[PDB]
Amino acid sequence: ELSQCDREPIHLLGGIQAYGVLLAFRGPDRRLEVVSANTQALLGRPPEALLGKTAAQVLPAELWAQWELLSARGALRVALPSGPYRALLHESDGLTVLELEPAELQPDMEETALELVRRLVSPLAGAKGTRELLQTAANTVRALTGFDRVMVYRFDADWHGEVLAESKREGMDGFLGMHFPATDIPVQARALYTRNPLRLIANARARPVPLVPSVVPELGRPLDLSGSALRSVSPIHLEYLRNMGVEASFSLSLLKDGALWGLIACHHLAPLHLSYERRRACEVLTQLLALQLSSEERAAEAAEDSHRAALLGPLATSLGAGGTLEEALAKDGARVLELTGATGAALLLGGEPLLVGRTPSMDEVEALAAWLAPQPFQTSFHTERLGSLYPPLAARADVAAGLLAVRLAPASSRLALWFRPEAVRTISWAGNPRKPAEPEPGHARLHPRGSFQAWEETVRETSPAWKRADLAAAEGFRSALIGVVLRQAAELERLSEALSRSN
Amino acid sequence: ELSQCDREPIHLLGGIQAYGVLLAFRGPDRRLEVVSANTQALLGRPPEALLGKTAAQVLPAELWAQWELLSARGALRVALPSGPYRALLHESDGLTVLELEPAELQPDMEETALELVRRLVSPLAGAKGTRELLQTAANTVRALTGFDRVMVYRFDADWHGEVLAESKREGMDGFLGMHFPATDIPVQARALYTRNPLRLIANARARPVPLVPSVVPELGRPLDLSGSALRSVSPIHLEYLRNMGVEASFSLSLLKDGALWGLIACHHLAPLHLSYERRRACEVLTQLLALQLSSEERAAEAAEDSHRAALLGPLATSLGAGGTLEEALAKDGARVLELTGATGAALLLGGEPLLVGRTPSMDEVEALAAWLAPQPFQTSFHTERLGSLYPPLAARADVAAGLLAVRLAPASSRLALWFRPEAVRTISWAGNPRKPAEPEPGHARLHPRGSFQAWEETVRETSPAWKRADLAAAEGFRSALIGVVLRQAAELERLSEALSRSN
Ligand SMILES: */C=C/C1=C(C)C(=O)N/C1=C\C1=NC(=C\c2[nH]c(/C=C3/NC(=O)C(C=C)=C3C)c(C)c2CCC(=O)O)/C(CCC(=O)O)=C1C
Numbered sequence A, B: 001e002l003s004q005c006d007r008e009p010i011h012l013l014g015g016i017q018a019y020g021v022l023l024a025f026r027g028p029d030r031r032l033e034v035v036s037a038n039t040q041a042l043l044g045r046p047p048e049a050l051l052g053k054t055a056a057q058v059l060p061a062e063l064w065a066q067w068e069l070l071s072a073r074g075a076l077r078v079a080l081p082s083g084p085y086r087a088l089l090h091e092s093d094g095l096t097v098l099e100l101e102p103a104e105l106q107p108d109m110e111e112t113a114l115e116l117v118r119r120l121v122s123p124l125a126g127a128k129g130t131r132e133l134l135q136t137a138a139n140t141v142r143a144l145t146g147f148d149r150v151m152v153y154r155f156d157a158d159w160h161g162e163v164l165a166e167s168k169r170e171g172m173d174g175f176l177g178m179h180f181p182a183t184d185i186p187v188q189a190r191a192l193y194t195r196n197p198l199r200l201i202a203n204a205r206a207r208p209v210p211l212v213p214s215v216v217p218e219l220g221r222p223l224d225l226s227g228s229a230l231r232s233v234s235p236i237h238l239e240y241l242r243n244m245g246v247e248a249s250f251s252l253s254l255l256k257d258g259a260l261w262g263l264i265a266c267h268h269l270a271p272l273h274l275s276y277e278r279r280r281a282c283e284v285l286t287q288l289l290a291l292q293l294s295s296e297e298r299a300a301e302a303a304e305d306s307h308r309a310a311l312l313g314p315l316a317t318s319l320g321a322g323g324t325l326e327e328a329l330a331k332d333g334a335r336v337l338e339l340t341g342a343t344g345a346a347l348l349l350g351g352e353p354l355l356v357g358r359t360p361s362m363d364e365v366e367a368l369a370a371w372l373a374p375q376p377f378q379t380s381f382h383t384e385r386l387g388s389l390y391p392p393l394a395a396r397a398d399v400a401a402g403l404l405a406v407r408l409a410p411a412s413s414r415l416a417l418w419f420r421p422e423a424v425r426t427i428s429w430a431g432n433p434r435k436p437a438e439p440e441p442g443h444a445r446l447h448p449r450g451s452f453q454a455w456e457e458t459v460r461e462t463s464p465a466w467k468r469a470d471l472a473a474a475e476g477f478r479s480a481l482i483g484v485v486l487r488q489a490a491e492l493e494r495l496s497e498a499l500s501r502s503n
């Protein structure tokens, strides 16, 4: 099995896990076009007999009694001689689908509606930090659901994923700082998770039981189960979970204005069950997290812009206090250095180029200054990778991964190189998984050990992107209160001319 | 209309409204303490004879069968021969209470909770800022209730009332931007509003039926009903609610980190009944609005401050471009006004006074510059009421009600000042509904006048308080960010004179 997954569609496997039982109705007859293989236990007749019979006869009276209310709402309690069963309606490909789920034996009088929502929303009374908000949400989710581990992901612009918050019981390895490639999650999976809020993987050991028409004749395709919540997982992802060691999963999809921002993944080692009320409350909890994250991301970006301005401001205090600027940058290296979130600065101002922080060598920076002139840059230049644009520094990686340049003078070549380290260097290596387990897995698919490589070779020779705040600060320092720099140059020159006349 | 209102104890009034009935119990013997006058219809036997009787025969057998069940939830729906009835239990004064309320005929099986919650949440998908958050929330709450006029109230630091947004159908009076003094909400009422989220006005027309006995013997005062949601309101508020003509109200409280930031008070001209599914939905909606309101408030700042810091930047571009400071302010007189959110600005860099915007004449400016030097302020002087701090300028405070002054020179007396207009002038006088009412009110207890008239005299010689961002910008103006850029003009002039007369 090679090159599998992305080619394979995931909405048309035609398989159902043994958790529930589904049937397909169509037309006034509501014929049993598609039936399950496990319906023998509940219906009491062989599935092939069920085929080609009217829905009124086949359905037990318990389900038929509240069928109108079931269509009105889509969820109500029906008690069978075996026991009570959750019932739902979902329309796919023009055919209605009746879904039956084994409800718990609990009387359900306890854990009433809307009180779990209060229990979940109470701890979030504070929650300043976006990362700390995700941490608190993970804590509450773990407290309610009882799963071993809760992890929260953020998706990068190119759909690279990382882990932000992690709430877990003591004992298992921490997964904070994880980075996994965008290709780990296929496009169709992202679309499906966008469409439906919750995904439940009841048990990994369970062998899927397929519905038993081979192919739908009228459609020519297996029945689509995208809306249905009983979709069977892909075998590749099943082996993923088997290698990782998690068997029951409960995944929540965080959406910011229709964009899949990240996922909450509740993981447990053994198959567990969750009540219907808890899941219904968790859907609302997902909506709350979506809204709160949508607001707080804007809050954090505004705060970062304000801090960038309030950091660029004091730089005018040093230059203007009397001390020469070339000594001033050495005096105040940190503030000028962190105006863009970069690690190296190099300045051309008329004299020999000056270096602050980790910067490329003298020959390298002068060659870069020579090379930058022919390209017409109206105000500034933004680049993500330097190897493609500039061959000579492609070999250099540790001080040549990122570049940001602004020309201080419109005519004269005044170059302000800003180098930001490679994404793999700026991110703490404490974020890697490490902790090598003794058993040897396939090492190609599973995340433990045999992963995090695709990230490092996909983003190799690439630095973290220059945010809107980063380029705004780049322009601001292209000025750097351009009055102070231009007027100190002019003032020094015009005092020097008077001194030379006095000379 | 007697003996004012502040001394009146709301907590201890112990009144029972028209619809529901109450009865108290003590200990395992559950001695009956108090009864309502209207319970005889529901109980079927005279209330006076049951004083101190056992619950076995006073109360119908069905409630006693569900007493242990009612204790768990604290509220339950039960079928009674008269009809469905809804009962509650809670603790007050060491004495347990049983409350009975008329019940809606719906068995709470159709359109249950946790599916209208998403109906309320979905419109909030946008709401880029606080104002539209409140607008959308008010609109959707109005849609849920079906009431006539929803309203939102905001309180200042000194508890003065604001009206941010409202949603109304066509054909009534609007009070957007209308103002009410802090004393309109008694200090007794604020703590109670903090304690419980929801309070419902059952019927304004119906007089409060008395509670029997008139007073409990053991305590000497009627038992309080803070936990109860049926507690009757003051007779003083009956005249108010009659004057505005509303019949029922449904008060929703918005608390941020334990403080009454806002208050939602729906109004309906005629009586209307709301089910507890809706009530338990809107209490969740208040808990909802709390967090998102905090988030949007916290996001609004650090963006206004960022814009002010960025706004100060082009003032530097006014320099370097050919011209002096006088000419720089001549072309750019607009931008310097919003640097501190003040309509007038004055500067004194050593020469004759120069003014921008509507500021006091130069003689009083010189007088205040002379007077501020004896007053010890190291970096800035932020006074909200000028007359209290400085008598002579109290006479003309239309534009000099509030001032922010900074010393340009470190030791010498060089000043930069900003003058804000007095309040009421800045606010949009839209609080008047126009259309003087054909009925004649007392002009002291109604929406227009009485309220917003005591408020105006309460905030005479007052301006919006100097926040953090405007003073930060003001101190940045004097700080070595643009002040040094101003100083460099002196060195440029010095080099010009060095070139002058010597060539
Ligand atoms: C060629 C594509 C795939 C290779 C790569 C592979 O191993 N699986 C592929 C496709 C699918 N991924 C599905 C679900 C899924 N996989 C991940 C990957 C992870 N990266 C990590 O660090 C961790 C945790 C340690 C994981 C699990 C994720 C995040 C997901 C989303 C759901 C989940 O978290 O389990 C998948 C099934 C569809 C779906 O459930 O979305 C296919 C097919």
Ligand SMILES: */C=C/C1=C(C)C(=O)N/C1=C\C1=NC(=C\c2[nH]c(/C=C3/NC(=O)C(C=C)=C3C)c(C)c2CCC(=O)O)/C(CCC(=O)O)=C1C
Pocket: B004, B005, B006, B153, B175, B179, B180, B183, B184, B185, B186, B189, B199, B233, B234, B236, B237, B240, B244, B249, B250, B251, B265, B445, B446, B447, B448, B451, B452
């Ligand atoms: C000190 C006595 C009072 C006079 C003064 C008065 O006008 N109100 C007094 C005390 C109480 N006010 C109560 C309710 C209430 N009052 C307001 C303020 C307003 N100012 C206005 O101009 C308008 C008209 C639009 C109003 C409504 C508000 C906002 C409220 C709460 C709204 C509500 O009833 O839900 C009151 C009873 C408290 C209660 O149970 O609500 C007292 C006592």
